[PDB]
Design a protein around this ligand. Structure first.
Ligand SMILES: NC(=O)[C@H]1C=CCN([C@@H]2O[C@H](COP(=O)(O)OP(=O)(O)OC[C@H]3O[C@@H](n4cnc5c(N)ncnc54)[C@H](O)[C@@H]3O)[C@@H](O)[C@H]2O)C1
Ligand SMILES: NC(=O)[C@H]1C=CCN([C@@H]2O[C@H](COP(=O)(O)OP(=O)(O)OC[C@H]3O[C@@H](n4cnc5c(N)ncnc54)[C@H](O)[C@@H]3O)[C@@H](O)[C@H]2O)C1
Ligand SMILES: Cc1cc2nc3c(=O)[nH]c(=O)nc-3n(C[C@H](O)[C@H](O)[C@H](O)COP(=O)(O)O)c2cc1C
Ligand SMILES: Cc1cc2nc3c(=O)[nH]c(=O)nc-3n(C[C@H](O)[C@H](O)[C@H](O)COP(=O)(O)O)c2cc1C
Lengths: 364, 364
């Protein structure tokens, strides 16, 4: 009968509470190197049961959005190490979210103007990425038509994830999260709509899943599976992705990742809603941690614990606006209101400046 | 090559950092029930790798000091549960320190004026406990002459610790620490000076250690050994205790507790100093966590990590005066100065009112 403040063993990691900070792209790293301002932003949120970092680009070609950080250079790794240490000195745990955008990119953000890469040469209809124009301004821009990866290029990409996991382990991260949730290369392999491949990487369920499962095994060699998670979005159809088989692939990956001993599966929820029985099935097929995310508040999060369908619940926008979110839940204190207009880009304002509760005792 | 901000697996508990909050009696619980003021005090220090609580009395007769909390009633357990939840909502881990004062007590603090209990009927020469006089004032007062426990009373005491561990597990504590360090019944059994027993609880090393090892096994049945620690003070001779064999008993207990799979041994240091080779021997005899405490600062704590003689270091007085101690170490920021005159008794002043660093961004 766990509450929100009942510690959870997530793989081999002890969490103090079940109020997780969702991965949140904030685009505050113009040079893609995290710095003192990240140390502050993540430090302020160190009370989270776990922090899952903003999506971080594993390579130059991995990028669809400028001002987002990387984990492919020595200078990036040292910046992240500064952030990780600061999360640790404030008592928290942080997982790095490993990102490849796939076809949700554009030649303008790509290095040397390279074409975006994907399972199949299909443009994401109506999708925008975020671009810095030649004149130094920046903005949303349509994604271009990608090239299909050659069957022989797939290992190089798996190696990019492996090497991002190696920099993560060295920088001190508690865990890694494979992003397969949205505007990402592994979800493109997974869905029928975006994957029209005829090599062993397309066709069947087992073929569509092979590339994502290799990425997972690659990062689990570095962290151990008991320190790896994955984010999935079955039933979602964002950035022009469509899928005919979201339930069967969810069941297959759950069984596959369950054998592997993965720490957790993390679902970003539909609200094209889940079928009845879906949550109960996931709980039976996967014995590790199940994290759900999508418009939760304290009572709805409790209900999923009571249901025995989640072990923990992640929160996005409320953690943007409340650095001491878990404490606000404990007290039933009113939440600060998020300001969508500073979600992305800029610097301290709408970032490190939403305030903590005043308990009447704490002094700075 | 761990630093102070390198996570540590302490038994089956993940710690974010190696800066531990030492157990600190503060005597702020007049009715012995923790309340909102403890929620605040321990919450403010939730960034500690682990918090070890003020010594808590396992029973009415366990007490030598008034205004210190207990863990023998339903109302005490609920107060502690409030504190533990608040530590969890601020992202920390807390261990309850289980206390029996033994002969460091007095009929005035005892219930119904009962004699203090001990291994042997020997007064602690020159020792003072803290007493509430009939007129409602309170102060230091000489300890009285205890009675020797009957051989048949020892299990009742072991059961008191077991039942305090059961209330601890139910209240949500991450771990328990057996206090055997100072002004406590298990250290009195251990030392030659205080233990002149001729039953199986005195004479040999193996007899002097039997009662303390039963307390440990009793609390390990409730928590699992991988969630239990013990605090020891070899070489110390406080509150009139003397010991002829501190090194041999330390080596014996280390081997005994090592077989048992205990999470950690926690030493409160001499400065009658340690023999050369003592730290290196402990490291070889005991494979779990070794915590040392006694006038540490950041650099001396680092040196013990570099030595491979400690896994973590605890801090007392600096955690009284600095709720964000680990962050101060990270930055090399100046520490607040402790005020010894509000170490004990009173309420918020010298308790919840030493301030955090101001980073220029955090707002209340
Ligand atoms: P919501 O889905 O409405 O986000 P948007 O569609 O505005 O933006 C999607 C992505 O576009 C980027 N974006 C969007 N706006 C910005 C600004 N101002 N700076 C930097 N980046 C920005 C950022 O990476 C976002 O995650
Ligand atoms: P240090 O060793 O100098 O502490 P003291 O010798 O003053 O006090 C030892 C114990 O005496 C108690 N003590 C000592 N002073 C007080 C006050 N003012 N209130 C409550 N309790 C007090 C408290 O439990 C202490 O841990
Ligand atoms: C500002 C913004 C940025 C986000 N960035 C990411 C991202 O980096 N990676 C990801 O997997 N999801 C991202 N998401 C989705 C969130 O992780 C979260 O799932 C979403 O906000 C829904 O949960 P919420 O209702 O509690 O905010 C983002 C959402 C928002 C609002
Ligand atoms: C205010 C005060 C209260 C203490 N209370 C306890 C106690 O409850 N239990 C215990 O084992 N040690 C207690 N100690 C010893 C501390 O846990 C710590 O070992 C001691 O202060 C030395 O470390 P330091 O130099 O960093 O403060 C106390 C020390 C002080 C200063």
């Amino acid at each position: 009968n766990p509450g929100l403040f009942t510690p959870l063993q997530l793989g081999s990691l002890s969490l103090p509470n079940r109020v997780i900070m969702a991965p949140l792209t904030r685009s505050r790293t113009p040079d893609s190197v995290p710095g003192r301002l990240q140390q502050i932003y993540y430090g302020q949120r160190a009370s989270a049961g776990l922090i899952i970092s903003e999506a971080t680009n594993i390579s130059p070609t991995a990028r669809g959005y400028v001002y987002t950080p990387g984990i492919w250079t020595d200078a990036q790794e040292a910046g992240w190490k500064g952030v990780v240490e600061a999360v640790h000195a404030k008592g928290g745990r942080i997982a790095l979210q490993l990102w490849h955008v796939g076809r949700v990119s554009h030649e303008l953000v790509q290095p040397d103007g390279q074409q975006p890469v994907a399972p199949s040469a299909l443009k994401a209809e109506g999708a925008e990425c975020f671009v810095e124009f030649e004149d130094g301004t920046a903005g949303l821009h349509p994604t271009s038509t990608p090239r299909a990866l050659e069957t022989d290029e797939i290992p190089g990409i798996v190696e990019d994830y492996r090497q991002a996991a190696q920099r993560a382990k060295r920088a001190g991260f508690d865990m890694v999260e494979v992003h397969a949730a949205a505007a990402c290369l592994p979800n493109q392999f997974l869905a029928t709509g975006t994957n029209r491949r005829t090599d062993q990487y397309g066709g069947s369920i087992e073929n569509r899943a092979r590339f994502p499962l290799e990425v997972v095994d690659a990062v689990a060699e570095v962290f151990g599976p008991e320190r790896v998670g994955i984010r999935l979005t079955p039933f979602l159809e964002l950035f022009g992705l469509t899928d005919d088989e979201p339930e069967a692939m969810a069941f297959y990956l759950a069984g596959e990742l369950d054998r592997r001993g993965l720490a957790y599966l993390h679902f970003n929820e539909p609200d094209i809603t889940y079928p009845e029985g879906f949550r109960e099935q996931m709980r039976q097929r996967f014995k590790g941690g199940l994290i759900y995310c999508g418009n939760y508040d304290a009572g709805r999060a409790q209900a999923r614990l009571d249901d025995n369908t989640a072990d923990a619940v992640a929160f996005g926008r409320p953690f943007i606006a409340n650095p001491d979110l878990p404490e606000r839940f404990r007290l039933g204190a009113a939440l600060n209101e998020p300001d969508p207009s500073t979600f992305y880009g800029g610097a301290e304002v709408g970032y490190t400046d939403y305030p903590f509760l005043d308990n009447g005792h704490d002094r700075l």
